[PDB]
């Protein structure tokens, strides 16, 4: 069966685990849990293709490490998540991008940008700038809430279409 190896990366606390769990299990997590790493597997249908998602939900560490590399290198496609009320998480997207490219030894890795917590108001990152970032990188941008579920299938199913097209 067609498997798609996805990895969800980004700064600590931006909602990588809430997005993934909302995908795997269709509910919202709201507890304090410093992920290390953990992988989810679910068979879903995408554009008529029955396939398997193999999702690696990483830690938001402040330090680079080979161990992280060891986990990351298996991924096919990366979901690069920030929170729209956390400016630092948005600046960090450049560093993830760079880290992903170095780890996959490639200049064109399937990747999508996500701005999570769209339910929360008084945002600190305007959509226009984030859309522009993605476009200067050549990749799609999706906005999302692990809370309302808005955009969550779009962000993930979208990364799959980037995997299929590279
Ligand atoms: N309102 C709102 N809260 C969110 C959203 N996504 C995550 N949160 C909350 O933000 C906090 C962090 O979520 P996590 O999913 O644990 O974040 P993370 O990126 O996995 O963090 P690390 O694994 O430590 O790197 C939790 O309190 C979540 O409930 C969202 O879309 N909206
Ligand atoms: C739930 C949790 O994160 N902890 C029990 C760790 C200790 N706490 C409360 C903690 C750690 C780190 C940071 N931080 O600098 O980001 C915290 N900010 O508020 N509580 C924090
Ligand atoms: Mg987590
Ligand atoms: Mg590309």
Q: What ranges in 104-151 are assigned the alpha helix state H?
A: 127-137
CA of 18 to the centre of ligand 1 (A): 6
Number of folded domains in the chain? Answer: 1
The residue whose C-alpha atom lies closest to atom 10 belonging to ligand 2 is 32
Domain that holds residue 111: 1-166
Closest-CA residue, ligand 2 atom 4, reads 32
Q: How far is the CA of 79 from the centre of ligand 2 (A)?
A: 25
- Distance, in Å, from the CA atom of 70 to the CA atom of 125, rounded to the nearest integer, reads 32
Name every residue whose Cβ is closer than 8 Å to that of residue 47 and which is 6 or more positions away in sequence: 161
Q: Strand order in 37-46's β-sheet?
A: 37-46, 49-58, 2-9, 77-83, 111-116, 141-143
Give CA–CA dist 81/124, Å, rounded.
15
Within 13 Å of residue 126, how many CA atoms lie on the same side as its CB? 3
Query: Sign of the CA dihedral 52, 96, 158, 26?
Result: positive
CATH number of the domain encompassing residue 43: 3.40.50.300
Resolution of this deposited model, Å: 1.3
Around ion ligand 4, residues with a beta carbon closer than 5 Å are 108
Q: Are 44 and 79 in contact (CB under 8 A)?
A: no
Q: What does the alpha-carbon distance between residue 33 and residue 43 come to, in Å, rounded to a whole number?
A: 26
Please state the atom number of ligand 1 nearest to the C-alpha of residue 61: 25
Ligand 2 contact via 30 beta carbon (within 6 Å): no
Q: Is the CB of 121 under 6 A from ligand 2?
A: no
């Amino acid at each position: 069966m067609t498997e798609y190896k996805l990895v969800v990366v980004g700064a600590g606390g931006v909602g990588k685990s809430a997005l993934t769990i909302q995908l795997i299990q269709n509910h919202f997590v709201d507890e304090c849990d410093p992920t290390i790493e953990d992988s989810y597997r679910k068979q879903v249908v995408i554009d008529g293709e029955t396939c398997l998602l193999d999702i690696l939900d990483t830690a938001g560490q402040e330090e680079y490490s080979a161990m992280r590399d060891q986990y990351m290198r298996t991924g096919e496609g990366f979901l690069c998540v920030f929170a729209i009320n956390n400016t630092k998480s948005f600046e960090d997207i450049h560093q993830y991008r760079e880290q992903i490219k170095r780890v996959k030894d490639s200049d064109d890795v399937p990747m999508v940008l996500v701005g999570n917590k769209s339910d929360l108001a008084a945002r600190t990152v305007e959509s226009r700038q984030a859309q522009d970032l993605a476009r200067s990188y050549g990749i799609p941008y999706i906005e999302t809430s692990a809370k309302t579920r808005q955009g969550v299938e779009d962000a993930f199913y979208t990364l799959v279409r980037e995997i299929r097209q590279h």
